Structure formats: C-alpha cells, structure tokens
C-alpha cells in the first residue's frame, strides 16, 4: 500500500532567491488583469443566469489561450434550492490530470442573487470576481513556467458555482457546488485505476481565495494543519516587502498576521475540510465593509493591494511546485 498520500505532510517548498523574486514581481501586470480578466466578470452571474454562462465562457476562454496544457472540465449537476430544482456548473482546470498530487487554488464564480434595487445590480467584485481574476492572472503570468510540467505533483484550479445562499445562509441553502464536488472527488479513485485512494487524497492543499480586493485585509491563520504554509505566505510577503517589490505596503499593516481564529467561517472549503483535506483559507477577518451590498463594486477595489497579493500568491505557487 503506497504511502504516497502522506507525501504532502513532508513536502517542502523550493525557495526563490532575490533575483527570481524580482522576476516574478515584474512578470505580473495588474492593469492587464484588470482589463482582460476582471472587468468581463463584473456582471450579474447568479446560478442559472445568462451572466453565469458568460462568466464560465470567459473563464474557459482565458485558460484555453495559454500554452500550458490545461484540461478543462465542467462539473454540472442538479440540486434542490429554496426555488426548486436547479442546475449548477463547477469549472475545474487541471495540469497533469493523472498526476497523483495537486496543489489546488480555488474561488467561487457565482455572484449572490439580488433583485435589482433602484437600478443597482450586485456584481460581488471582491466576492469573488477579484479572486477569480487573480487565478486567471496567475495562470497567465506563470504560463511559461507551468508549461514545463507537461514529486508527482501539479496544479489545479477550481471555480465553484453556487457558493452563495439564494436567501440568507442556511446549511441546505449555500455551498452547492463545493458540497457536490467534495463528495464527487471523495468517491472518485485516483490516480486512474487506484484501488483505495481518491481525488481528495491527492489534494495536497486547498488554497481558497475569497473576499479579496478591499483595502487593508488581514488574513488570520485558521488551521493548525496548514499553519506552516500560512507561515510561508508571511515569509514571502516580508521578503517581497524588504526587496521593495510591493506597493503602498508596510509591515505594521501586513496582510498575513500571526493570529489564530477559533470560529468557523462558512465557505467552499467546509465540505473539503470535513473530509480531511488541508485548507489554507485566504479570507480576511473582518470582511470587506462592502460585503453583500451593492457597493461591492469596481470603484471600491484597492488596486495596489490586489497587485501585492498576486505577487505573493504567484511566488507561493512556484515555490510549492518547485518551479
């Protein structure tokens, strides 16, 4: 019985030196992400809506144009909702599908349903159009490096549908796509032909991005079994800062602070966490002041903060993957 699912417990990053850190800082472009990945997503896109379809096509199109060998799968299913049966579609983008282990980055691409109000439309800019655009920018920025993957370890991106409650949050009305996908992955043998390991055993770490884009976020270290990876993010932020590679940033106002959080935040990682998958939940505490209001829009986003976080996340991913 191979002990491969235990490898994630000992996996160590391959730390980039200064020269490589500057290369990564210069290789990502917040303005290109803004125009080409973010703005097309700033539309109403609740499950089943025409915007949901447009959002999904945009995400797939942006991934399909890259050189790395991404394999796209749309996981479509039915679920009961306060409005009756409905269809949802998770988007999964994977490099090396048969690779035994994957580092997984995720976010939700649906937007919370709200009837139009005084002509305002909810577009959930930080929740989670920006996280989505950040995953797309990361795939674009590291494309040349990711091409080299074409440690049996690779990368996967999941864009969940139906994270939001149709009404207010309840156990049965929220996390439609993640509850579905976690159960599906838990019952899918992996790698192909395996006797007793599933796709969940292959998830080295689930990095879930949510509510990102507002000024001064503070991300707490939620779980002891991913704490050493939260520390890597702190170290990366500190060195990019010291190298003068971040913008309008100070260590007193650093994003990754040394502090736990006992409570439970309901989000897409829950169904995975509860089946034993290690999770790094990149959600700030407190939430953006515009959370679930019509003001969660483009105008209230903090560009240099998103830019800094794109740099930190891209360095984290390269180091994790030894690229």
Residues forming contacts to Zn ion in the complex (CB under 5 A) are 127
Closest CB to Zn ion among 90 and 154?
A: 90
Nearer to Zn ion by Cβ, of 127 and 307: the residue is 127
**How far apart are CB 106 and Zn ion at their closest, in Å?**
15
CB of 129 to Zn ion, least distance (A): 11
d(CA 45, CA 32): 22
Q: How far is the CB of 27 from Zn ion (least distance, A)?
A: 31
Going by C-alpha positions, the residue among 202, 232, 230 that lies closest to residue 102 is 202
Shorter beta-carbon distance to Zn ion: residue 110 or 307:
110
Pick 266 or 304: Cβ nearer Zn ion: 266
* Nearest CB to Zn ion, comparing residues 127 and 237: 127
Find the shortest distance in angstroms from Cβ 111 to Zn ion. 8
- The token pair at 288 is 């953006």
Least distance (Å) between residue 127 CB and Zn ion: 4
CB of 233 to Zn ion, least distance (A): 23
Q: Which is nearer to Zn ion, 5 or 271 (CB)?
A: 271
Of 127 and 239, the one with the shorter C-beta distance to Zn ion is: 127
CB of 290 to Zn ion, least distance (A): 11
Residue at shortest CB range from Zn ion: 127
Q: If DSSP states are collapsed to H, E and C, what string results for the chain?
A: CCCHHHHHHCCCCCCCCHHHHHHHHHHCCHHHHHHHHHHHHCCCCCCCCHHHHHHHHHHHHHHHCCCCCCEEEEEEEEECCCCCCEEEEEEEEECCCCCCEEEEEEEECCCCCCCCECCECCCCHHHHHHHHHHHHHHHHHCHHHHHCCCCCEEEEEEEECCCCCCCCCCCCCCCHHHHHHHHHHHCCECCCCCCCCECCCCEEEEEEECCCCCCCCCECCCCHHHHHHHHHHHHHHHHHHHCCCCCCCCCCCCCECCCCCCCCCCCCCHHHHCCCCCEEEECCCCCCCCCCCCCCCHHHCCHHHHHHHHHHHHHHHHHHHCC
């Amino acid at each position: 019985a191979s002990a491969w699912p235990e490898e994630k417990n000992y996996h160590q990053p391959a730390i980039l030196n200064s020269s490589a850190l500057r290369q990564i800082a210069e290789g990502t472009s917040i303005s290109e992400m803004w125009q080409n990945d973010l703005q097309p997503l700033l539309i109403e896109r609740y499950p089943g809506s025409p915007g949901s379809y447009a959002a999904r096509q945009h995400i797939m199109q942006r991934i399909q144009r890259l050189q790395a060998d991404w394999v796209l799968e749309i996981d479509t299913f039915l679920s009961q909702t306060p409005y009756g049966y409905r269809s949802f579609s998770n988007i999964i983008s994977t490099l090396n599908p048969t690779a035994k282990r994957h580092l997984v980055l995720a976010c939700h691409y649906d937007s919370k349903y709200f009837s139009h109000w005084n002509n305002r439309v909810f577009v959930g800019a930080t929740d989670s159009a920006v996280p989505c655009a950040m995953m797309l920018e990361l795939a674009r920025a590291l494309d040349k490096k990711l091409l080299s993957l074409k440690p049996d370890l690779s990368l996967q991106l999941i864009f969940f549908d139906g994270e939001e409650a149709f009404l207010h949050w309840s156990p049965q009305d929220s996390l439609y796509g993640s509850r579905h996908l976690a159960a599906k992955m838990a019952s899918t043998p992996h790698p192909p032909g395996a006797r007793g390991t599933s796709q969940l055993h292959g998830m080295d770490l689930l990095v879930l991005l949510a509510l990102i884009g507002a000024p001064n976020p503070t991300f707490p270290n939620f779980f002891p079994n991913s704490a050493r990876w939260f520390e890597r993010l702190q170290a990366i932020e500190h060195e990019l800062h010291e190298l003068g590679l971040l913008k309008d940033h100070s260590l007193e106002g650093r994003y990754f602070q040394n502090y736990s959080y006992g409570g439970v935040i309901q989000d897409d990682h829950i169904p995975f966490l509860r089946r034993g998958v290690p999770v790094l939940h990149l959600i700030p505490s407190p939430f953006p002041e515009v959370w679930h209001t019509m003001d969660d829009n483009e105008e209230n986003l903090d560009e240099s903060t998103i830019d800094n976080l794109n740099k930190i996340l891209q360095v984290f991913v390269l180091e994790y993957l030894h690229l």
